[PDB]
Amino acid sequence: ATYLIGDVHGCYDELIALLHKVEFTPGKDTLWLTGDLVARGPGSLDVLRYVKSLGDSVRLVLGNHDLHLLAVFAGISRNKPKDRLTPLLEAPDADELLNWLRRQPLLQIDEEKKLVMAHAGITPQWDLQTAKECARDVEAVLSSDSYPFFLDAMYGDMPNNWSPELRGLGRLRFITNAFTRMRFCFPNGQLDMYSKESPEEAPAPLKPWFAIPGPVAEEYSIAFGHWASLEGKGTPEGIYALDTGCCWGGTLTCLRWEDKQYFVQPSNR
Ligand SMILES: [Mn+2]
Ligand SMILES: [Mn+2]
Numbered sequence: 001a002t003y004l005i006g007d008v009h010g011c012y013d014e015l016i017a018l019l020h021k022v023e024f025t026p027g028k029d030t031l032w033l034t035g036d037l038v039a040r041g042p043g044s045l046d047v048l049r050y051v052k053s054l055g056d057s058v059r060l061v062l063g064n065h066d067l068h069l070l071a072v073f074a075g076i077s078r079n080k081p082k083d084r085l086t087p088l089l090e091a092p093d094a095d096e097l098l099n100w101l102r103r104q105p106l107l108q109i110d111e112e113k114k115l116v117m118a119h120a121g122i123t124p125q126w127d128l129q130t131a132k133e134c135a136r137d138v139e140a141v142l143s144s145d146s147y148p149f150f151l152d153a154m155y156g157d158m159p160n161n162w163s164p165e166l167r168g169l170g171r172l173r174f175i176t177n178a179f180t181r182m183r184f185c186f187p188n189g190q191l192d193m194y195s196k197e198s199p200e201e202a203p204a205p206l207k208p209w210f211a212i213p214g215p216v217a218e219e220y221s222i223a224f225g226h227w228a229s230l231e232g233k234g235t236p237e238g239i240y241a242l243d244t245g246c247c248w249g250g251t252l253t254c255l256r257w258e259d260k261q262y263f264v265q266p267s268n269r
Pocket of ligand 2: 007009036226228243
């Protein structure tokens with residue numbers, strides 16, 4: 001079977017309970033994870049150990065909190081106490097875990113399932129070939145010996161409009177923001193980098209990225225996390241918002257792909 005789970009955010013206990021509920025069996029089942037494995041929740045270290053141990057039975061995409069963790073680890077950014085990353089950072093196996101983490105994709109595609117996954121979604125200004133190439137560019141920098149320089153460069157909210165003639169720092173920043181921070185769009189597809197509230201509360205003319213027709217979303221289903229104020233509701237057919245805010249006292253959501261059946265674990269907080 002195929003299972004998709006939203007942002008775990010260090011909620012190791014809830015993740016294991018949810019997986020036991022569906023009797024996830026490595027080697028017979030595959031787990032897709034929408035990223036943001038770490039931060040807020042108490043057990044980022046345990047989540048990383050477990051997910052890494054799953055090997056080929058897991059398909060991950062990196063989120064904005066995974067990339068922030070890598071930036072803290074590399075000395076690029078300051079550790080925030082509320083993230084509760086210190087046990088993972090100080091762990092004897094931290095180098096191994098994080099060198100594995102930075103090697104993971106930004107985008108997962110399964111042609112047989114007609115399924116695409118990224119942390120925040122697929123921006124409507126991209127087709128599948130462009131999404132693939134941008135994923136590869138950022139993955140190449142993240143998995144290189146020089147990744148701290150990229151991580152330092154990634155911060156910033158501009159440029160917010162895609163053009164194939166984007167080059168250098170601006171190109172990398174747009175790709176990163178589109179894959180891991182995108183929520184709202186302007187009518188032409190421009191990224192808004194400020195509003196984090198629900199669609200109902202969004203000021204005009206902002207619309208969810210998935211409310212704007214795009215080539216990928218017309219040929220593929222898209223699963224994503226990141227957007228917790230969405231609370232997994234209000235998406236069109238073929239769009240699955242799996243982030244239901246476990247770390248925030250909400251729930252961890254699992255979707256079985258074969259029958260589109262949902263399973264939920266309540267937050268312990
Ligand atoms: Mn996120
Ligand atoms: Mn999140």
